[PDB]
Structures are given as C-alpha cells and as structure tokens.
Amino acid sequence: VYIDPTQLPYDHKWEFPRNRLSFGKTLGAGAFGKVVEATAYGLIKSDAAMTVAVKMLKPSAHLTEREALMSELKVLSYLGNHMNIVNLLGACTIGGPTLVITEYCCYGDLLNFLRRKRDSEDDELALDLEDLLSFSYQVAKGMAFLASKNCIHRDLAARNILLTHGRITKICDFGLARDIKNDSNYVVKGNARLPVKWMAPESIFNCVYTFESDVWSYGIFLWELFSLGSSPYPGMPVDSKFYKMIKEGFRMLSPEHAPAEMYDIMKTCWDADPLKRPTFKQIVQLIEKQISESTNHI
Amino acid sequence: VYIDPTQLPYDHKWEFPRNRLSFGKTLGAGAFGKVVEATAYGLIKSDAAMTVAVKMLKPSAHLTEREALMSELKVLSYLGNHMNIVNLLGACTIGGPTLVITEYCCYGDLLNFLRRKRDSEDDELALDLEDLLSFSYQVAKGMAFLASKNCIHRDLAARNILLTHGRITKICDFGLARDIKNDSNYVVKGNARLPVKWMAPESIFNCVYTFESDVWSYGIFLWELFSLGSSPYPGMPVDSKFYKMIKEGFRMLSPEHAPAEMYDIMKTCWDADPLKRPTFKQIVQLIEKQISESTNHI
Ligand SMILES: CCc1cc(NC(=O)Nc2ccc(-c3cnc(Nc4cc(N5C=CN(CC)C=C5)ncn4)s3)cc2)no1
Ligand SMILES: CCc1cc(NC(=O)Nc2ccc(-c3cnc(Nc4cc(N5C=CN(CC)C=C5)ncn4)s3)cc2)no1
C-alpha cells in the first residue's frame, strides 16, 4: 500500500527562519512554482552559511498547489536521508508562504549533462561508460530506497536526476517547478500533460501508478542514459499509432553504446506484464555485478 | 640519504612463471625496452587470470640496461604498495630475461588524457576542475610516499602519470620504455637527453637530484595539468637563452584555469632556493584544504 502524503506528519525540528535565507538564481520554474538557489545562514552549523535549494510557489498558485507543496515537504521528511535522493534540510511553514529547503546539486540535471557529452577514442569511450554504469547504479539504489518506503516517484527521467560533487547522482522531482507546457516531453493525454513516452502502459491506459510502473520508467531512463540524452522513441510523435504500437509490444532497440546486460535490464523493465519486470532491489544487484566485472575490462 | 637501488634485496615471493604470461599490445617502447600488456594466469588467485603490464628489455640492451631493470624491480619491491604508484605484482628472474610485472592502468597516461580534454559551459568547467584537483592531490600523495621511502623520481611529468578505474592516478616511470630520441620534451644536455623543461636549476647545472628537485618537477606538472596538457614554456626552445632566463628567475605565468592557490603552490615549487620549496607532505595538506573548500563552491 503506497503512502498517502497528506497523512504524514510534519516535525518542527525542520523549521528554519526564512529571514536567514538569501535567494539567488532560479534553478527551474513552471506556472505555479520554482526552485531557487539560496544561502542559508546557520542551517547546520550556527556560524556557517551553506548553499541550498528552495522550492516555493508563485502568487498564481491555488489551494491545490499549496497543499501539494506541503505534501512534498511531508514526503521528504518521511523519506529521511539517502545519498541518491535530494535530501530535505529544513522548511519555513510560518511567517509567510511555505518554503521547502533541500540540498543543492552543483552540476544540474543529468539530461543536460548527457546532451553536452554528445555535442562533443576508446579511452574516453571507456571512461564515459564507467560513469554511465555508476549513474545507473546510483539511480537504482535511490529508487530501491523510495520503494522500500512505499513511495512511487511517477516521473522518473534523466531530467529529474541531478549531478553533484563526486559525480554523485540524486533523484529529484522538479514537479511544479517545471514548465511542462513548453516541455515537448510532456504531452496532453486527457486532462493533463503527462510524460507519456516514459510511462508504463497501465499508467497510460488506466492511470495506475505502482512500484512496477516506476521500473518501466527506469528502463526508459536507461535508454536515454546510454543514448547520451536522446529523447526516447526518436521520430515518433505521441498519437494514436504510438499507443497501439506500445500495446502490441513494440519497444525501442538497444542504444548503440549500451552494454548487453544493460540492454537486457531495459527490455525486462518494459515487459507488458508488470509482475515480470524486475524490482529495483533486483536491478541494484544486477548492476553491482556489471560494475564488479568492469574492473576485468580493458 | 637517498636509496641506492643496487643495494636493495629481492624477495623470491614475487617470482612468477613466465609461461603463465600471455603477451598483448605494446604500451610503450624505447631503444632498449618496452612495456607490454599481458594476461597473467594465477598471479593472485590460482584459478583467475588478470591483466598486468610487463616491462622487459629488447635484444639490443646492454649490461647497463639489464642492471637498470633489475634495480627497478628491487626499488618497486622495496617501495611496497601505495594507491597512487604503479605497484609491483611479480617478476620473472629465472628461465629467461628479466620480466617485471606490475599493475595495468586502463586509461593510459595523463598527458594524452589532458590533450583530448583540450581538443574539445560552466558546469563542464567545474567538473573538470574537480578532476584536476583530485589528480593534483593523488600525485602529491604518491610523491609524499616516495619521499618517505627516501626515493627520488627524477622524471615526474604528466607523461609519467597513469589514469585507471575510478579516476585513480598512479605515478609511473616508463624509463627505458620511452622513445626519448623522438620525444621533443627530452633535449640533449651534454651526454644525455634530459627533460630539461621539467628540471630544477640545480639538476640542470649540477646534475644533482634531490627531494626538492622532485618538488620543482611537480610544479611543472601542475602547470601542464591546469593547461590541459600544453608543453611548458610554450614557444621557447631549450637553448642558451632558456638556461640564463631560468637562472635569472623568470618563470611561467599562471595557467588561465589554475585556481589561485594552485598557482601559489606552483610558484613555491619553482623557488630558486630548494630549502624554500614546500615538501610533498606540505603540498598534500594544502591541496586537501582546497578540495575541502571546493564543496563550498557553486
Ligand atoms: C525523490 C523524492 C522527492 C523529491 C521531491 N522534491 C524535489 O526534489 N524538489 C527539488 C528540490 C531541489 C531541486 C534542486 C537541487 N539542486 C539543483 N541544482 C541545479 C543546478 C543547476 N545548474 C545549472 C547550471 N549551472 C551552471 C551555472 C549550475 C547549476 N540547474 C538546475 N538545478 S535543483 C530540484 C527539485 N519530492 O520527492
Ligand atoms: C613510481 C616509482 C617507480 C615506477 C617504476 N617503473 C614503472 O612504472 N614501470 C612501468 C610499469 C607499468 C607501466 C604501465 C602500466 N599500465 C599502463 N597502461 C597504459 C595504457 C595505455 N592505453 C592506451 C590506449 N588505450 C585505448 C586502447 C588503452 C590503454 N597506454 C599506455 N599505458 S603503462 C608503466 C611504467 N619505477 O619506479
């Protein structure tokens, strides 16, 4: 049974005075919200200031978005700390609109990182592959953690993975801080704009999100990861024929640089039967083995 | 008092049967020697084969080179294991010419790695700087280890630094496995071809090699490191005017992307007074501080 975010607690140990925040550049924004870099004085050590990210709503937000941001705060507090998630550091729930303070990741999102690597010899090939295997491993570990907490991400994709010091990757969710109106990867399906090319068939046709639909999305993520940031199903618009092709079982081919075993993981993530897809804990063990064998590769 | 390699022991615990080696590609070669990749069956685990590097002489070698390679074996056995040195794994001292078996580094030398990075946005700039700081730190730690064993390298330079899995750097010495006749970075000075642009003035003018002359060479290494592999003193040939300019105190300017504190380290490595140059253990602590402060940088 997946978590109901509205029925999680909020611990005032997270409370931080908003006047100790100094806001900087906007890191992302959508219609109703934004994430902004900031300096937080005294957040961790009383005499130290540190860089954080702050998610907040815009004045155009309604009750639904206000409740959504408080629910996000509650989820982040409930999840606790994991190396491969963006971690909560504090919050401002009094003295003004809700502010949610998290870690700042210094290299931006993985999608942009990948697309520069492709807008660019076997040694470089090999080193890039070492990084990509690491990224696949870290994301699977962060997702296994989310699943262990009965949490569903619902929008896993390279654009929702951040890179920071040490080439550590952290899963995030820009959510309301993304301009999905102007992001072609989000397409109108009924009443909402959804990332359909990342979504499992049961999510598309039944609006059902599960542990297993997150795994499907992880498979698409692996494909963009080893395609250096290409959009999935290249050349195909999301329309009537795309839905039928997915129902009949058509799938993307392997990326040209994906290792054979990473392609096999992709394929199993895209099984039409959710019960046949691997779990994230199973994926972690499979990638661990590939990394372990990669020290045997020259 | 620096080690006399000829008066070090050889422990037959290192002995490995040469028929268990399967030779592959040549990794480097000079007039008298070469380093070759190989598979070694049973070197560490009795049923496992692993990739190694093997240094060996060519049939043109004389007694002087044969003694040199045995001395190299002895030095490597005496140094023992350090993460940031190429480590000895075994040797073949019977049944044929001397073979010296070491770790294989899978990404090649740092000089070539750097020159591809320059034959190629703030996020990429920042990530490259994180790597370069790491490389400077790891090389200083390997050199501090060599100095602690009263060992002098005598040819420290990016071409003698290897990169391997995990972006770990290992100091090496291709030595006789380098074609210094055809490497313009080695210039005739008297009877030998020496890497003069990397050499301290006391080494050039008195043929004296010390702990402090290694530090000078490390300073030049930092310059090529932050110049993405450019040759030092660009545009200046090594001739009469170069020697006088170095004697009078002229030095290279900062690389454009070197952090201020890494430039200050460079400058102190190039002090005309060897007793005023930092030790490698002092350099390790200074770079540790820069890396620690780099998590404060966005
Ligand atoms: C997973 C479970 C979950 C999470 C969640 N909420 C949730 O993640 N909010 C949320 C909070 C925080 C963030 C961010 C944290 N750091 C960020 N850094 C950057 C840097 C960047 N750069 C671009 C360019 N340059 C060169 C100048 C540098 C930097 N560009 C964009 N962003 S963005 C994202 C989303 N809810 O559930
Ligand atoms: C420090 C104290 C000391 C050391 C010492 N002796 C001492 O280091 N010998 C010595 C032993 C071993 C080595 C080497 C170990 N691994 C190496 N790998 C590569 C890889 C490479 N690639 C190029 C291209 N590609 C794409 C196909 C892949 C790989 N190219 C060149 N080399 S070279 C060097 C020198 N004596 O004292």
XYZ file of C-alpha atoms and ligand atoms in Angstrom:
670
model
C 0.000 0.000 0.000
C 1.577 3.218 -1.254
C 1.901 6.248 1.034
C -0.808 8.902 1.236
C 1.336 12.051 1.548
C -1.447 14.074 3.194
C -1.415 11.678 6.173
C 2.261 12.057 7.041
C 3.479 14.139 9.993
C 5.500 17.340 9.974
C 8.207 17.657 12.636
C 9.035 21.197 13.634
C 12.669 20.146 14.056
C 12.917 21.126 10.365
C 11.718 24.687 10.983
C 14.184 27.380 9.854
C 13.686 31.183 9.924
C 13.072 32.488 6.422
C 14.959 35.712 7.151
C 18.153 33.596 7.278
C 17.731 32.736 3.584
C 19.347 34.859 0.867
C 17.885 33.990 -2.525
C 19.860 33.708 -5.745
C 19.281 32.333 -9.229
C 16.170 30.426 -10.260
C 17.107 26.813 -10.963
C 13.771 25.900 -12.536
C 10.256 27.321 -12.777
C 6.823 26.371 -14.007
C 3.415 28.052 -13.959
C 2.869 27.751 -10.192
C 6.254 27.150 -8.596
C 10.002 27.464 -8.764
C 13.215 26.207 -7.235
C 15.769 28.872 -6.344
C 19.344 28.630 -5.155
C 19.919 30.309 -1.815
C 22.360 30.797 1.028
C 21.068 29.610 4.415
C 22.841 31.111 7.435
C 23.069 28.810 10.431
C 21.101 25.921 8.944
C 23.545 23.204 10.076
C 26.319 24.992 11.985
C 25.310 28.133 13.833
C 28.116 30.289 12.375
C 28.178 28.785 8.857
C 26.228 29.598 5.717
C 25.637 26.918 3.097
C 24.131 26.755 -0.377
C 20.682 25.160 -0.552
C 17.822 24.855 -2.998
C 14.439 26.305 -2.008
C 11.160 25.240 -3.606
C 8.340 27.785 -3.328
C 5.103 28.681 -5.061
C 4.358 31.665 -7.264
C 1.476 34.041 -6.429
C -0.619 32.362 -9.158
C -0.780 29.123 -7.133
C -4.130 27.875 -5.817
C -5.099 25.792 -2.791
C -4.310 22.616 -4.746
C -0.693 23.672 -5.281
C -0.320 24.939 -1.702
C -1.464 21.545 -0.425
C 0.848 19.838 -2.941
C 3.923 21.657 -1.666
C 3.138 20.864 1.977
C 2.648 17.225 0.959
C 6.041 17.282 -0.765
C 7.571 18.629 2.458
C 5.894 15.816 4.404
C 7.108 13.129 1.986
C 10.675 14.440 2.090
C 10.630 14.467 5.886
C 9.224 10.919 5.957
C 11.761 9.541 3.479
C 14.685 10.671 5.564
C 18.193 10.758 4.200
C 19.643 8.757 1.311
C 22.796 9.551 -0.666
C 20.990 9.241 -4.021
C 17.907 11.371 -3.254
C 17.718 15.137 -2.881
C 17.531 15.427 0.888
C 15.376 17.758 2.947
C 17.378 20.203 5.082
C 14.657 22.436 6.551
C 11.435 24.284 5.924
C 9.618 27.556 6.553
C 5.986 26.852 7.427
C 5.300 30.058 9.391
C 5.863 33.754 8.764
C 4.920 33.548 5.099
C 4.244 31.071 2.294
C 5.635 27.561 2.592
C 9.340 27.197 1.724
C 10.968 23.771 1.291
C 14.760 23.740 1.784
C 16.799 20.891 0.286
C 20.337 20.066 -0.759
C 21.688 21.961 -3.772
C 23.284 19.853 -6.538
C 26.057 21.779 -8.219
C 26.142 20.305 -11.755
C 22.482 20.489 -12.791
C 20.326 17.778 -14.267
C 21.605 14.637 -15.959
C 19.687 15.290 -19.179
C 21.697 18.438 -19.931
C 24.933 16.782 -18.786
C 24.312 13.956 -21.271
C 23.411 16.224 -24.183
C 26.689 18.120 -23.842
C 28.581 14.811 -23.751
C 27.013 14.003 -27.127
C 27.588 17.515 -28.515
C 31.250 16.567 -28.285
C 38.837 7.424 -28.867
C 38.393 4.201 -26.913
C 39.820 5.592 -23.641
C 37.225 8.378 -23.495
C 34.526 5.888 -24.524
C 35.596 3.565 -21.705
C 35.688 6.316 -19.073
C 32.261 7.632 -20.101
C 30.888 4.095 -19.809
C 32.299 3.829 -16.290
C 30.377 6.991 -15.378
C 27.160 5.794 -17.037
C 27.276 2.484 -15.176
C 27.799 4.432 -11.955
C 24.809 6.667 -12.716
C 22.595 3.672 -13.489
C 23.672 2.066 -10.196
C 23.112 5.170 -8.056
C 19.667 5.829 -9.531
C 18.612 2.211 -8.985
C 19.779 2.455 -5.360
C 17.842 5.681 -4.789
C 14.739 4.117 -6.370
C 15.110 0.936 -4.288
C 15.139 3.219 -1.258
C 11.969 5.038 -2.380
C 10.220 1.715 -2.972
C 11.332 0.466 0.458
C 9.443 3.459 1.913
C 6.343 2.577 -0.190
C 6.901 5.726 -2.260
C 6.219 5.982 -6.013
C 8.102 8.616 -7.995
C 5.745 8.829 -11.042
C 8.113 10.997 -13.173
C 11.492 9.255 -13.268
C 13.592 10.511 -16.207
C 17.058 11.959 -16.780
C 15.571 15.456 -16.406
C 14.670 14.524 -12.799
C 18.183 13.281 -11.872
C 20.730 15.749 -10.524
C 24.529 15.528 -10.554
C 26.723 16.926 -7.796
C 30.223 16.830 -6.275
C 31.955 13.487 -6.728
C 29.676 12.539 -9.656
C 27.034 11.564 -7.111
C 23.544 11.459 -8.653
C 20.431 12.399 -6.701
C 16.870 11.701 -7.795
C 14.650 14.778 -7.610
C 11.211 15.892 -8.788
C 11.028 19.419 -10.149
C 7.260 18.937 -10.251
C 5.541 22.319 -10.181
C 8.950 23.972 -10.799
C 8.983 22.679 -14.407
C 7.342 24.477 -17.349
C 5.642 21.368 -18.713
C 3.532 23.499 -21.058
C 6.735 24.223 -23.000
C 8.464 20.833 -22.472
C 7.686 18.695 -25.527
C 8.402 15.575 -23.434
C 5.052 16.248 -21.671
C 2.050 15.679 -23.933
C -1.668 16.237 -23.402
C -3.387 12.935 -22.582
C -6.931 13.673 -21.478
C -6.958 16.371 -18.801
C -3.221 16.590 -18.009
C 0.172 16.874 -19.687
C 1.982 13.651 -18.902
C 5.441 12.271 -19.803
C 3.829 9.524 -21.848
C 6.989 8.228 -23.516
C 8.307 7.401 -20.013
C 5.051 5.849 -18.750
C 4.068 2.198 -18.404
C 1.033 1.024 -20.417
C -1.010 0.500 -17.246
C -0.316 4.121 -16.325
C -1.256 5.419 -19.769
C -4.451 3.406 -20.195
C -5.605 3.021 -16.570
C -3.971 5.966 -14.712
C -2.462 3.409 -12.337
C 0.955 4.141 -10.817
C 2.797 1.370 -8.962
C 6.226 0.131 -7.932
C 6.321 -1.632 -11.309
C 5.415 1.430 -13.382
C 8.382 3.209 -11.789
C 10.549 0.328 -13.023
C 9.240 0.836 -16.565
C 10.266 4.497 -16.320
C 13.684 3.458 -15.064
C 14.044 1.370 -18.232
C 13.345 4.408 -20.397
C 15.845 6.347 -18.267
C 18.498 3.704 -19.006
C 17.797 4.198 -22.697
C 18.301 7.971 -22.592
C 21.316 7.423 -20.321
C 23.093 5.216 -22.873
C 21.842 7.308 -25.820
C 23.590 10.378 -24.337
C 20.331 12.199 -23.753
C 18.338 11.492 -26.913
C 14.586 11.627 -26.491
C 13.012 8.140 -26.468
C 11.154 6.678 -29.452
C 13.007 9.105 -31.760
C 10.949 10.423 -34.656
C 7.626 9.056 -33.379
C 5.005 11.558 -32.202
C 2.787 10.555 -29.292
C -0.532 9.941 -31.044
C -2.989 7.144 -31.795
C -0.395 4.959 -33.535
C 2.122 5.289 -30.693
C -0.381 3.984 -28.139
C -1.314 0.986 -30.293
C 2.332 0.177 -31.060
C 3.121 0.130 -27.337
C 0.066 -2.060 -26.648
C 1.093 -4.545 -29.344
C 4.556 -4.856 -27.777
C 6.893 -2.734 -29.904
C 9.864 -1.399 -27.971
C 12.937 0.716 -28.560
C 16.046 -1.015 -29.856
C 19.230 -1.060 -27.798
C 21.266 2.152 -27.674
C 24.415 1.607 -29.693
C 26.675 2.020 -26.635
C 24.565 0.185 -24.022
C 26.299 -2.924 -22.623
C 24.449 -6.125 -23.480
C 23.387 -6.702 -19.880
C 22.122 -3.113 -19.511
C 20.038 -3.662 -22.648
C 18.616 -6.834 -21.115
C 17.670 -4.855 -17.999
C 15.938 -2.276 -20.228
C 13.949 -4.971 -22.017
C 12.758 -6.539 -18.776
C 11.701 -3.146 -17.400
C 9.467 -2.887 -20.482
C 7.666 -6.208 -20.025
C 3.951 -5.783 -20.693
C 3.343 -7.872 -17.565
C 4.249 -5.723 -14.531
C 4.801 -8.847 -12.431
C 7.567 -9.925 -14.844
C 9.562 -6.703 -14.503
C 12.497 -6.717 -12.062
C 12.264 -4.931 -8.758
C 14.653 -2.093 -8.024
C 16.428 -4.230 -5.433
C 16.945 -6.881 -8.143
C 18.259 -4.230 -10.545
C 20.733 -2.970 -7.915
C 22.249 -6.451 -7.601
C 22.492 -6.889 -11.389
C 24.285 -3.565 -11.901
C 26.555 -4.260 -8.921
C 27.681 -7.370 -10.798
C 28.349 -5.439 -14.023
C 30.415 -2.832 -12.181
C 32.325 -5.609 -10.410
C 33.055 -7.275 -13.761
C 34.001 -3.941 -15.350
C 37.321 -3.964 -13.498
C 38.053 -7.042 -15.649
C 37.595 -4.952 -18.823
C 40.399 -3.230 -20.737
C 70.330 9.853 2.238
C 68.612 8.644 -0.925
C 68.337 4.921 -1.689
C 70.988 3.088 -3.698
C 68.789 0.732 -5.751
C 71.606 -1.771 -6.343
C 71.788 -2.440 -2.582
C 68.156 -3.431 -2.104
C 67.045 -7.052 -1.672
C 64.950 -9.191 -3.988
C 62.381 -11.469 -2.339
C 61.521 -14.568 -4.306
C 57.941 -14.282 -3.045
C 57.475 -12.153 -6.191
C 58.619 -14.931 -8.531
C 56.033 -15.911 -11.169
C 56.442 -18.452 -14.013
C 56.839 -16.658 -17.326
C 54.916 -19.372 -19.175
C 51.786 -18.153 -17.330
C 52.032 -14.796 -19.127
C 50.224 -14.185 -22.422
C 51.525 -11.024 -24.070
C 49.391 -8.461 -25.865
C 49.818 -4.920 -27.145
C 52.915 -2.815 -26.549
C 52.029 0.068 -24.240
C 55.299 1.933 -24.760
C 58.761 1.265 -26.175
C 62.146 2.898 -26.447
C 65.510 1.839 -27.861
C 66.261 -0.787 -25.193
C 62.981 -1.676 -23.515
C 59.223 -1.846 -23.663
C 56.126 -2.247 -21.544
C 53.560 -4.732 -22.832
C 50.059 -5.554 -21.681
C 49.621 -9.188 -20.725
C 47.322 -11.707 -19.099
C 48.820 -13.447 -16.051
C 47.173 -16.750 -15.108
C 47.159 -17.499 -11.398
C 49.114 -14.432 -10.301
C 46.799 -13.557 -7.384
C 44.088 -16.237 -7.333
C 45.117 -19.669 -8.539
C 42.187 -20.056 -10.971
C 41.976 -16.419 -12.142
C 43.737 -14.543 -14.916
C 44.254 -10.793 -14.648
C 45.578 -8.035 -16.883
C 49.050 -6.771 -15.979
C 51.783 -4.660 -17.504
C 55.178 -6.277 -18.126
C 58.392 -4.296 -18.545
C 61.161 -6.110 -20.427
C 64.279 -5.317 -22.410
C 64.835 -5.601 -26.142
C 67.699 -7.723 -27.535
C 69.688 -4.514 -28.171
C 70.033 -3.906 -24.413
C 73.477 -3.995 -22.786
C 74.654 -4.881 -19.284
C 73.839 -1.340 -18.133
C 70.174 -1.718 -19.089
C 69.961 -5.256 -17.676
C 71.252 -3.958 -14.343
C 68.852 -0.996 -14.586
C 65.806 -3.226 -14.957
C 66.801 -5.429 -12.011
C 67.324 -2.258 -9.965
C 63.844 -1.079 -10.959
C 62.454 -4.429 -9.779
C 64.299 -4.004 -6.473
C 63.023 -0.446 -5.971
C 59.437 -1.472 -6.702
C 59.682 -4.347 -4.235
C 61.174 -2.034 -1.591
C 58.544 0.678 -2.044
C 55.708 -1.706 -1.373
C 52.131 -0.820 -2.148
C 50.579 2.637 -2.459
C 47.308 3.527 -4.188
C 48.941 6.301 -6.249
C 52.008 4.397 -7.514
C 52.126 1.644 -10.114
C 52.505 -1.380 -7.871
C 54.709 -4.412 -8.390
C 52.765 -7.675 -8.725
C 55.505 -10.184 -9.587
C 58.644 -10.850 -11.561
C 60.413 -13.431 -13.707
C 64.102 -13.539 -12.796
C 64.813 -17.110 -13.958
C 64.129 -19.081 -17.124
C 64.882 -16.163 -19.422
C 65.468 -12.406 -19.431
C 64.180 -10.356 -16.519
C 60.443 -9.552 -16.619
C 58.878 -7.012 -14.237
C 55.120 -7.454 -13.690
C 53.073 -4.502 -12.419
C 49.505 -3.257 -12.296
C 47.953 -2.267 -15.629
C 46.263 1.164 -15.771
C 43.360 1.096 -18.177
C 43.124 4.726 -19.381
C 46.719 5.473 -20.393
C 48.858 8.419 -19.433
C 47.567 11.729 -18.110
C 49.297 13.769 -20.815
C 47.175 12.218 -23.573
C 44.044 12.367 -21.404
C 44.601 16.111 -20.938
C 45.292 16.835 -24.604
C 41.992 15.252 -25.634
C 40.187 17.314 -22.983
C 41.594 20.426 -24.671
C 40.862 19.147 -28.196
C 37.241 19.510 -27.137
C 29.856 25.777 -20.233
C 30.480 26.436 -16.548
C 29.195 23.022 -15.375
C 31.726 21.144 -17.515
C 34.425 23.620 -16.456
C 33.563 22.999 -12.802
C 33.543 19.206 -13.142
C 36.878 19.197 -14.988
C 38.350 21.336 -12.206
C 37.133 18.827 -9.623
C 39.024 16.107 -11.508
C 42.177 18.221 -11.864
C 42.239 18.993 -8.145
C 41.840 15.274 -7.472
C 44.732 14.450 -9.812
C 46.973 17.054 -8.181
C 46.110 15.605 -4.755
C 46.708 11.965 -5.718
C 50.053 12.726 -7.364
C 51.222 14.718 -4.337
C 50.243 11.800 -2.082
C 52.129 9.296 -4.238
C 55.181 11.589 -4.262
C 54.997 12.104 -0.481
C 55.073 8.320 -0.212
C 58.134 8.045 -2.484
C 59.929 10.718 -0.463
C 59.031 8.929 2.786
C 60.921 5.912 1.387
C 63.926 8.150 0.507
C 63.184 7.625 -3.192
C 63.660 10.299 -5.882
C 61.612 10.014 -9.066
C 63.800 12.225 -11.349
C 61.271 12.348 -14.255
C 57.934 13.484 -12.826
C 55.653 14.821 -15.588
C 52.128 14.217 -16.872
C 53.548 11.671 -19.338
C 54.660 9.589 -16.319
C 51.232 9.625 -14.589
C 48.702 6.925 -15.429
C 44.912 7.002 -15.082
C 42.834 3.953 -14.210
C 39.423 2.787 -12.956
C 37.750 5.285 -10.643
C 39.893 8.167 -11.970
C 42.688 6.956 -9.707
C 46.094 8.270 -10.823
C 49.282 6.256 -10.415
C 52.796 7.625 -10.795
C 54.948 5.515 -13.108
C 58.293 5.752 -14.901
C 58.318 4.463 -18.459
C 62.087 4.947 -18.362
C 63.725 2.712 -20.954
C 60.250 2.009 -22.424
C 60.057 5.575 -23.815
C 61.496 6.647 -27.184
C 63.196 9.759 -25.828
C 65.128 10.175 -29.082
C 61.810 11.085 -30.732
C 60.193 12.874 -27.741
C 60.860 16.599 -28.176
C 60.331 17.058 -24.416
C 63.752 15.368 -23.943
C 66.643 17.518 -25.158
C 70.369 16.840 -25.425
C 72.208 18.435 -22.491
C 75.787 17.203 -22.511
C 75.890 13.414 -22.789
C 72.196 12.585 -22.236
C 68.713 13.579 -23.372
C 67.025 15.064 -20.334
C 63.558 16.566 -19.703
C 65.125 19.952 -19.061
C 61.913 21.984 -19.012
C 60.803 19.858 -16.022
C 64.157 20.006 -14.197
C 65.244 22.170 -11.273
C 68.196 24.530 -11.869
C 70.416 22.536 -9.502
C 69.684 19.444 -11.588
C 70.410 21.207 -14.875
C 73.625 22.929 -13.806
C 74.978 20.480 -11.200
C 73.374 17.105 -12.113
C 72.055 16.961 -8.550
C 68.706 15.254 -7.924
C 67.032 15.634 -4.524
C 63.693 15.590 -2.734
C 63.462 19.291 -3.616
C 64.184 18.861 -7.330
C 61.263 16.420 -7.468
C 59.103 19.191 -5.993
C 60.211 21.557 -8.767
C 59.112 18.940 -11.309
C 55.791 18.595 -9.523
C 55.314 22.345 -10.009
C 55.824 21.994 -13.754
C 53.395 19.055 -13.685
C 50.770 21.286 -12.039
C 51.264 23.758 -14.869
C 50.675 21.186 -17.615
C 47.798 19.763 -15.553
C 45.943 23.094 -15.472
C 46.986 23.968 -19.045
C 45.246 20.790 -20.293
C 48.486 19.231 -21.453
C 50.326 22.123 -23.098
C 54.090 21.807 -23.121
C 55.747 24.120 -20.564
C 57.479 27.373 -21.518
C 55.449 27.471 -24.761
C 57.319 28.835 -27.762
C 60.737 28.852 -26.070
C 63.355 26.384 -27.321
C 65.748 24.905 -24.774
C 68.983 26.707 -25.636
C 71.464 29.171 -24.152
C 68.835 31.856 -23.511
C 66.464 29.438 -21.762
C 69.129 28.433 -19.237
C 70.018 32.049 -18.441
C 66.358 33.070 -18.143
C 65.768 30.279 -15.624
C 68.907 31.274 -13.684
C 67.799 34.913 -13.527
C 64.431 33.855 -12.082
C 61.935 34.005 -14.952
C 59.040 31.599 -14.532
C 55.890 30.579 -16.349
C 52.759 32.619 -15.731
C 49.690 31.022 -14.179
C 47.587 28.768 -16.410
C 44.350 30.570 -17.157
C 42.245 27.942 -15.343
C 44.533 27.232 -12.359
C 42.951 28.180 -9.009
C 44.829 30.975 -7.257
C 46.094 28.669 -4.518
C 47.290 26.062 -7.045
C 49.218 28.835 -8.800
C 50.795 29.800 -5.481
C 51.856 26.176 -4.977
C 53.406 26.200 -8.472
C 55.361 29.366 -7.722
C 56.759 27.985 -4.478
C 57.806 24.744 -6.187
C 59.867 26.949 -8.521
C 61.769 28.831 -5.816
C 65.432 29.144 -6.770
C 66.254 28.177 -3.178
C 65.458 24.457 -2.757
C 65.093 24.916 1.001
C 62.231 27.376 0.377
C 60.180 24.952 -1.721
C 57.379 23.054 0.045
C 57.743 19.396 0.855
C 55.329 16.920 -0.675
C 53.744 16.332 2.728
C 53.149 20.102 2.974
C 51.647 20.137 -0.528
C 49.286 17.268 0.378
C 47.872 19.285 3.286
C 47.440 22.420 1.144
C 45.543 20.577 -1.600
C 43.451 18.734 0.998
C 42.303 22.166 2.168
C 41.419 23.309 -1.366
C 39.392 20.158 -2.012
C 37.645 20.605 1.341
C 36.779 24.206 0.437
C 35.671 23.187 -3.066
C 32.455 21.728 -1.658
C 31.684 25.354 -0.713
C 31.923 26.381 -4.392
C 28.982 26.623 -6.796
C 12.991 11.961 -4.927
C 11.831 12.137 -3.952
C 11.269 13.558 -3.992
C 11.976 14.728 -4.304
C 10.991 15.780 -4.206
N 11.170 17.197 -4.402
C 12.311 17.778 -5.044
O 13.190 17.099 -5.492
N 12.348 19.213 -5.158
C 13.561 19.682 -5.768
C 14.443 20.221 -4.841
C 15.680 20.680 -5.228
C 15.995 20.594 -6.567
C 17.366 21.055 -6.994
C 18.523 20.936 -6.189
N 19.664 21.359 -6.776
C 19.523 21.814 -8.020
N 20.643 22.294 -8.775
C 20.560 22.776 -10.121
C 21.720 23.302 -10.660
C 21.642 23.755 -11.964
N 22.785 24.370 -12.576
C 22.722 24.760 -13.837
C 23.804 25.418 -14.392
N 24.869 25.667 -13.649
C 25.991 26.362 -14.245
C 25.921 27.839 -13.881
C 24.919 25.303 -12.374
C 23.837 24.642 -11.817
N 20.477 23.735 -12.589
C 19.390 23.228 -12.034
N 19.428 22.759 -10.803
S 17.871 21.706 -8.468
C 15.138 20.030 -7.504
C 13.885 19.560 -7.114
N 9.851 15.205 -3.851
O 10.037 13.900 -3.734
C 56.814 5.387 -9.314
C 58.019 4.565 -8.868
C 58.543 3.674 -9.994
C 57.793 3.123 -11.043
C 58.756 2.381 -11.823
N 58.534 1.593 -13.009
C 57.346 1.666 -13.808
O 56.462 2.429 -13.544
N 57.269 0.808 -14.961
C 56.015 0.930 -15.650
C 55.171 -0.144 -15.402
C 53.904 -0.184 -15.936
C 53.521 0.874 -16.733
C 52.118 0.859 -17.288
C 51.009 0.303 -16.609
N 49.829 0.440 -17.252
C 49.893 1.081 -18.418
N 48.723 1.306 -19.215
C 48.723 2.005 -20.466
C 47.524 2.038 -21.154
C 47.523 2.723 -22.355
N 46.335 2.753 -23.158
C 46.321 3.448 -24.282
C 45.196 3.407 -25.085
N 44.166 2.658 -24.728
C 42.997 2.623 -25.584
C 43.051 1.379 -26.461
C 44.192 1.936 -23.616
C 45.317 1.977 -22.810
N 48.653 3.235 -22.811
C 49.780 3.177 -22.122
N 49.818 2.557 -20.960
S 51.521 1.529 -18.718
C 54.341 1.971 -16.968
C 55.623 2.016 -16.424
N 59.928 2.519 -11.217
O 59.779 3.285 -10.148
